[PDB]
Amino acid sequence: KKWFSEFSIMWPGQAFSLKIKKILYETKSKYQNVLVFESTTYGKVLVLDGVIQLTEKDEFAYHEMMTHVPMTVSKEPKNVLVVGGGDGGIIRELCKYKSVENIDICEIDETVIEVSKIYFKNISCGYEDKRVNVFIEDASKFLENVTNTYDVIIVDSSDPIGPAETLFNQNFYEKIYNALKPNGYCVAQCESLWIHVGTIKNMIGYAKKLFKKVEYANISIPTYPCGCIGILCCSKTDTGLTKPNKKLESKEFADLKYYNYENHSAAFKLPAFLLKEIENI
């Protein structure tokens, strides 16, 4: 059996590898190289431009924290935007909320959606929900043109090198701010505290120019570089996103594997070195 190895200039001098049971699908889409394989111990794996996007074994950690942090704080979220997220993980978690009336998703690469529907049925199941509306477009452009405002925006993007380049700048955060309701919230994929402090500082700086409360949370997930990835958390009120307003007690949430009421707040308790780096932004 051969091994898949994840290299990037975004994490120089380190690599994570997974043993390949079998390769399932490969293509070059309009935007990126796509690889799907069954790993020996992590289930099926989606790879975009050589970077692990998700695995079956651990995706719930990232999808549950990204979704349930803002969705338990927002009082009565009706309209939600997912930026990126073609795999459907975020949408799957959002559909658990009966109060949600509309879920828009803006994914740049339609190939990702169709690959997820074929190879990852338990992740992409949310596309069958009638509330879900799909837009195939660079979210940077979508957000410039949208007429609606949202209660929650979830930026489920890949890394700043690649198609997600347009999502890691000041202008993007202006577009997010404007596309949110006066009491709206945004959470965004915001990299690893172990290797990406420069990016984290930059992103916090962008968010603070517009949002009155900007916070950072950490998620444990073994198949992202350094075994963790952060959530940049953006609020227009000053109460912020650290404290949930509701408990997820209905039958739809009985299946949760990572998120709970207590670890919501725990995720925001950061290592000393990180607090020091971000204090004067």
Place this chain on the structure above:
Amino acid sequence: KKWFSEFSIMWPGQAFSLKIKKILYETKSKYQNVLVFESTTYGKVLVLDGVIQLTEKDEFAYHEMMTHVPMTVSKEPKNVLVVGGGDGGIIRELCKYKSVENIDICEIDETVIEVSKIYFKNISCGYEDKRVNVFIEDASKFLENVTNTYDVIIVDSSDPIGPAETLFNQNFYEKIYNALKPNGYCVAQCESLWIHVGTIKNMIGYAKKLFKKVEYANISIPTYPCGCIGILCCSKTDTGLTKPNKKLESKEFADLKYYNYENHSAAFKLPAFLLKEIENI
């Protein structure tokens, strides 16, 4: 430049790799294969039997959490035992406490100590402290023969495959219980929640047979498998180890890079799936 890759049957189907700037030292000791190299991005790395023991870039996460969790809960710790810990990381953190009167360390492999003194001077600096007493012995035997009792025991061991095999059983926890003061605490290296739930359940079961309060905490550290490692936390009172009794405010602690008052308690807030697995032990 070549790469070092970490394989083990303890984590099948996955591997973490570090690019090698230069190899510094290799030997087969009485107990294990020893490798020291300068990595390109993680500083110097100590490898025992092909398993990463520490790197300069991140060791503070594990050494600070392992030490300061029990040491901020124990009221006036005077006598502390470190089991394993030849590298000196735990001892370095313990020496910051002026109230400590004695630190015993029982390391099986004297080669590890001497390698750390040569190649890792900023980790092994605690050996110069006059309170430190070194024992070269299997801790399983040391703990059977010791006459003293301790306020805190820190089990800084490697994995159950290898010399640390004697430290992952019921009899060992009996020896720990007996070697502790009536209000003593023990913390022990207890593997990754992402891949080692069987071991975690077993270890909790062993501890619960003797300790009235058994708790589990998680540490983010990129160079241990799955990017995290747990602390098994053992108390003879029922108050447990989740809440520190003191703040580390003196000049000796100004340098802390991970541990703080808030993340002490946060470390014990575990993912939903783990809580479910351990609930009926």
